[PDB]
Protein backbone atom coordinates (compact mmCIF):
# COMPACT_ATOMS: atom_id res chain seq x y z
CA UNK A 1 0.00 0.00 0.00
CA UNK A 2 2.09 2.64 -1.65
CA UNK A 3 -0.83 5.75 -0.99
CA UNK A 4 -0.61 6.63 2.15
CA UNK A 5 3.67 7.14 2.11
CA UNK A 6 4.87 10.44 3.46
CA UNK A 7 6.33 11.69 0.91
CA UNK A 8 4.18 10.68 -1.89
CA UNK A 9 0.92 12.02 -0.46
CA UNK A 10 2.83 15.36 0.42
CA UNK A 11 4.78 15.70 -3.02
CA UNK A 12 1.22 15.34 -4.16
CA UNK A 13 -0.51 17.35 -2.26
CA UNK A 14 2.36 20.28 -2.50
CA UNK A 15 2.08 20.21 -6.68
CA UNK A 16 -1.76 20.27 -6.56
CA UNK A 17 -1.23 23.20 -4.48
CA UNK A 18 1.40 24.84 -6.72
CA UNK A 19 -1.30 24.31 -9.62
CA UNK A 20 -4.21 25.78 -7.65
CA UNK A 21 -2.05 28.76 -6.45
CA UNK A 22 -0.60 29.71 -9.99
CA UNK A 23 -4.11 29.62 -10.98
CA UNK A 24 -5.48 32.01 -8.52
CA UNK A 25 -2.64 34.12 -9.26
CA UNK A 26 -2.51 34.49 -12.89
CA UNK A 27 -3.92 38.42 -12.59
CA UNK A 28 -1.00 39.61 -11.09
CA UNK A 29 1.53 37.57 -13.13
CA UNK A 30 3.37 35.82 -10.69
CA UNK A 31 4.02 31.86 -10.00
CA UNK A 32 3.60 30.83 -6.45
CA UNK A 33 7.50 30.71 -6.02
CA UNK A 34 7.95 33.91 -7.74
CA UNK A 35 4.96 35.46 -5.14
CA UNK A 36 6.60 33.23 -2.29
CA UNK A 37 10.59 34.90 -3.18
CA UNK A 38 8.70 38.43 -3.45
CA UNK A 39 6.73 38.04 -0.54
CA UNK A 40 10.28 37.07 1.53
CA UNK A 41 12.12 39.93 -0.09
CA UNK A 42 9.23 42.10 1.04
CA UNK A 43 9.78 40.75 4.65
CA UNK A 44 13.09 40.63 5.05
CA UNK A 45 14.24 44.26 3.33
CA UNK A 46 17.42 45.39 0.07
CA UNK A 47 19.57 42.39 1.68
CA UNK A 48 22.04 40.49 1.17
CA UNK A 49 21.31 36.73 0.79
CA UNK A 50 22.46 34.13 -0.59
CA UNK A 51 20.81 31.90 -3.42
CA UNK A 52 20.93 28.78 -1.18
CA UNK A 53 19.74 30.32 2.04
CA UNK A 54 16.80 32.07 -0.18
CA UNK A 55 16.05 28.56 -1.74
CA UNK A 56 15.87 27.09 1.30
CA UNK A 57 13.57 29.92 2.82
CA UNK A 58 10.89 29.44 0.12
CA UNK A 59 11.55 25.83 0.19
CA UNK A 60 12.86 25.08 -3.46
CA UNK A 61 16.28 24.55 -5.22
CA UNK A 62 18.85 26.98 -5.84
CA UNK A 63 18.72 26.42 -9.62
CA UNK A 64 15.32 26.60 -9.52
CA UNK A 65 15.05 29.66 -7.36
CA UNK A 66 18.02 31.26 -9.26
CA UNK A 67 16.17 31.00 -12.88
CA UNK A 68 13.21 32.07 -11.26
CA UNK A 69 15.44 35.38 -9.71
CA UNK A 70 16.12 35.94 -13.23
CA UNK A 71 13.16 35.69 -14.93
CA UNK A 72 11.88 38.05 -11.92
CA UNK A 73 14.69 40.52 -12.31
CA UNK A 74 14.15 40.44 -16.25
CA UNK A 75 10.88 41.57 -15.78
CA UNK A 76 11.88 44.43 -13.65
CA UNK A 77 10.26 42.92 -10.49
CA UNK A 78 12.95 42.45 -8.10
CA UNK A 79 16.96 43.97 -8.09
CA UNK A 80 19.99 42.14 -8.32
CA UNK A 81 23.33 43.03 -7.72
CA UNK A 82 26.56 42.12 -5.69
CA UNK A 83 26.45 42.39 -1.94
CA UNK A 84 26.03 36.73 -1.29
CA UNK A 85 23.80 38.66 -3.58
CA UNK A 86 21.95 42.11 -2.90
CA UNK A 87 18.17 41.83 -3.67
CA UNK A 88 15.97 44.40 -4.00
CA UNK A 89 11.93 45.03 -4.57
CA UNK A 90 11.03 47.47 -7.00
CA UNK A 91 7.96 49.70 -7.31
CA UNK A 92 6.39 47.25 -9.88
CA UNK A 93 7.48 44.31 -7.31
CA UNK A 94 5.37 45.45 -4.93
CA UNK A 95 2.79 46.29 -6.93
CA UNK A 96 2.49 42.60 -8.47
CA UNK A 97 2.80 41.74 -4.66
CA UNK A 98 0.80 43.89 -3.76
CA UNK A 99 -2.02 42.74 -6.36
CA UNK A 100 -1.58 39.27 -5.92
CA UNK A 101 -1.98 39.22 -2.66
CA UNK A 102 -5.81 39.19 -2.11
CA UNK A 103 -5.40 36.90 -5.10
CA UNK A 104 -3.39 34.08 -2.60
CA UNK A 105 -5.74 35.51 0.34
CA UNK A 106 -8.76 33.40 -1.59
CA UNK A 107 -6.74 30.73 -2.08
CA UNK A 108 -5.56 30.60 0.92
CA UNK A 109 -9.00 30.18 2.57
CA UNK A 110 -11.12 27.99 0.25
CA UNK A 111 -8.30 25.67 0.44
CA UNK A 112 -7.56 25.63 4.40
CA UNK A 113 -11.14 25.33 4.01
CA UNK A 114 -11.08 21.66 3.71
CA UNK A 115 -9.26 20.98 7.37
CA UNK A 116 -11.05 21.20 10.59
CA UNK A 117 -7.90 23.94 12.26
CA UNK A 118 -5.41 24.94 9.55
CA UNK A 119 -2.56 26.25 11.88
CA UNK A 120 -2.92 22.89 13.86
CA UNK A 121 -2.82 20.90 10.37
CA UNK A 122 0.13 23.56 9.17
CA UNK A 123 2.01 22.53 12.27
CA UNK A 124 1.94 19.02 11.72
CA UNK A 125 2.95 19.34 8.23
CA UNK A 126 5.81 21.52 9.10
CA UNK A 127 6.88 19.46 12.25
CA UNK A 128 6.27 16.64 9.51
CA UNK A 129 9.09 18.12 6.98
CA UNK A 130 11.27 18.91 10.01
CA UNK A 131 10.86 15.46 11.30
CA UNK A 132 12.20 14.63 7.89
CA UNK A 133 15.06 16.93 7.97
CA UNK A 134 16.49 15.82 11.00
CA UNK A 135 16.44 12.17 9.64
CA UNK B 1 1.45 36.83 7.55
CA UNK B 2 2.68 34.79 4.27
CA UNK B 3 4.16 32.19 7.17
CA UNK B 4 0.95 29.95 7.12
CA UNK B 5 1.32 30.15 3.93
CA UNK B 6 -0.30 25.99 2.52
CA UNK B 7 1.79 25.93 -0.92
CA UNK B 8 4.87 26.81 1.16
CA UNK B 9 4.47 24.67 4.41
CA UNK B 10 3.68 21.88 2.22
CA UNK B 11 6.34 22.48 -0.29
CA UNK B 12 8.81 22.69 2.10
CA UNK B 13 7.38 19.70 4.03
CA UNK B 14 7.43 17.72 0.60
CA UNK B 15 11.00 18.79 -0.25
CA UNK B 16 12.48 17.57 3.21
CA UNK B 17 10.12 14.43 2.84
CA UNK B 18 11.75 13.35 -0.05
CA UNK B 19 15.45 14.06 0.69
CA UNK B 20 14.35 11.66 4.13
CA UNK B 21 13.78 9.03 1.43
CA UNK B 22 16.01 9.61 -0.96
CA UNK B 23 18.26 9.02 2.11
CA UNK B 24 16.75 5.77 3.40
CA UNK B 25 16.39 4.18 -0.42
CA UNK B 26 19.88 4.57 -1.13
CA UNK B 27 20.91 0.84 -0.66
CA UNK B 28 18.60 0.19 -3.60
CA UNK B 29 20.25 2.70 -5.69
CA UNK B 30 16.86 4.65 -6.49
CA UNK B 31 15.73 8.00 -6.16
CA UNK B 32 11.92 8.51 -4.31
CA UNK B 33 10.38 9.71 -7.49
CA UNK B 34 12.19 6.45 -9.55
CA UNK B 35 10.40 5.13 -6.79
CA UNK B 36 7.24 6.19 -7.01
CA UNK B 37 7.10 5.95 -10.29
CA UNK B 38 8.01 2.12 -10.38
CA UNK B 39 5.47 2.09 -7.47
CA UNK B 40 2.80 3.43 -9.52
CA UNK B 41 3.20 1.07 -13.08
CA UNK B 42 3.27 -1.59 -10.94
CA UNK B 43 -0.36 -0.74 -9.98
CA UNK B 44 -0.68 8.75 -20.74
CA UNK B 45 2.48 10.96 -19.99
CA UNK B 46 0.58 13.54 -18.11
CA UNK B 47 -1.66 11.59 -16.63
CA UNK B 48 1.57 9.26 -15.10
CA UNK B 49 3.23 12.59 -13.89
CA UNK B 50 -0.06 14.38 -11.87
CA UNK B 51 -0.44 10.68 -10.49
CA UNK B 52 3.45 10.17 -8.76
CA UNK B 53 3.36 14.23 -8.27
CA UNK B 54 5.81 14.99 -11.00
CA UNK B 55 5.88 17.70 -13.84
CA UNK B 56 6.10 16.29 -17.45
CA UNK B 57 9.41 17.13 -18.29
CA UNK B 58 10.58 15.83 -14.62
CA UNK B 59 8.54 12.26 -15.57
CA UNK B 60 9.96 11.97 -18.89
CA UNK B 61 13.22 12.44 -18.03
CA UNK B 62 13.57 9.86 -15.25
CA UNK B 63 11.55 7.46 -17.32
CA UNK B 64 14.81 8.00 -19.54
CA UNK B 65 16.93 7.08 -17.07
CA UNK B 66 14.94 4.52 -16.05
CA UNK B 67 14.07 2.58 -18.98
CA UNK B 68 17.56 3.09 -20.01
CA UNK B 69 19.16 1.53 -16.93
CA UNK B 70 16.52 -1.49 -17.62
CA UNK B 71 13.71 -0.89 -14.87
CA UNK B 72 11.33 -0.09 -17.52
CA UNK B 73 10.48 -0.86 -21.09
CA UNK B 74 5.36 1.04 -20.01
CA UNK B 75 5.98 -2.30 -18.05
CA UNK B 76 8.06 -3.06 -15.40
CA UNK B 77 11.05 -5.53 -16.58
CA UNK B 78 12.63 -8.55 -14.04
CA UNK B 79 14.74 -5.43 -12.74
CA UNK B 80 12.41 -2.77 -12.79
CA UNK B 81 10.39 -4.96 -10.12
CA UNK B 82 13.37 -6.40 -8.10
CA UNK B 83 14.69 -2.80 -7.80
CA UNK B 84 10.81 -1.62 -6.26
CA UNK B 85 10.52 -5.37 -4.31
CA UNK B 86 14.39 -3.98 -2.74
CA UNK B 87 13.58 -0.84 -2.03
CA UNK B 88 9.97 -1.66 -0.21
CA UNK B 89 11.42 -2.52 3.21
CA UNK B 90 13.27 0.86 2.96
CA UNK B 91 10.10 2.83 2.05
CA UNK B 92 8.86 1.30 5.05
CA UNK B 93 11.54 1.86 7.86
CA UNK B 94 11.38 5.33 6.85
CA UNK B 95 7.95 5.77 6.80
CA UNK B 96 7.52 4.34 10.22
CA UNK B 97 10.13 6.58 11.00
CA UNK B 98 9.12 9.95 9.86
CA UNK B 99 5.27 9.24 11.03
CA UNK B 100 6.03 8.61 14.36
CA UNK B 101 6.29 12.31 14.56
CA UNK B 102 2.97 12.76 14.83
CA UNK B 103 -0.44 11.84 16.38
CA UNK B 104 -2.50 9.68 13.66
CA UNK B 105 -0.52 9.68 10.57
CA UNK B 106 -3.95 8.52 8.73
CA UNK B 107 -6.07 11.24 10.24
CA UNK B 108 -2.85 14.11 9.04
CA UNK B 109 -2.30 12.27 5.90
CA UNK B 110 -5.97 12.42 5.05
CA UNK B 111 -5.59 16.54 6.15
CA UNK B 112 -2.96 16.69 3.73
CA UNK B 113 -4.68 14.90 0.96
CA UNK B 114 -7.96 16.84 1.55
CA UNK B 115 -5.45 19.98 1.18
CA UNK B 116 -3.91 18.82 -2.05
CA UNK B 117 -7.47 17.37 -3.15
CA UNK B 118 -8.81 20.84 -1.89
CA UNK B 119 -6.74 22.85 -4.43
CA UNK B 120 -7.39 20.41 -7.39
CA UNK B 121 -11.16 20.98 -6.69
CA UNK B 122 -10.01 24.69 -8.05
Do not use: H
Request: charged letters at 25%; hydrophobic letters at 40%.
Amino acid sequence: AFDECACYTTRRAARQLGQAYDRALRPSGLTNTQFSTLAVISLSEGIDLTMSELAARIGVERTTLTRNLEVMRRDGLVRVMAGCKRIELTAKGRAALQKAVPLWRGVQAEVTASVGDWPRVRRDIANLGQAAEAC
